[PDB]
């Protein structure tokens, strides 16, 4: 804060401030999915008969 | 042979390494020259196709 150093002593020296780092590197996602080429033979729920 | 013709069919098909006759030893088929038959074909269930 400041507290009260008297005008007869030098006083203490404050450490200024600062210093904080961090890392958040990798991440990933990959939704592979199949087309199923033999699924197209039968009738889909759509595509009215 | 009268109203009917005589055709001797000695066709052969190859197995893995040997020959075999299309017809059995002793059979005959009463047929018609205009008898309609289907040479129908399926669908190619290939991904590239």
Curated annotation (Swiss-Prot), chain B:
Family: Belongs to the lambda phage major capsid protein family.
Compartments it resides in: Virion; Host cytoplasm
Role noted for this protein: Assembles to form an icosahedral capsid with a T=7 symmetry. The icosahedral capsid is about 60 nm in diameter and composed of 415 major capsid proteins. The assembly is primed by the interaction between capsid assembly protease and portal dodecamer, and major capsid proteins assemble cooperatively to form the procapsid with the help of capsid scaffolding protein. Major capsid protein forms hexons and pentons of the icosahedron. Viral genomic DNA is packaged into the procapsid through the portal vertex.
Description of how the protein assembles with itself and partners: Homomultimer. Interacts with FI protein.
Name of the molecule in the record: Major capsid protein
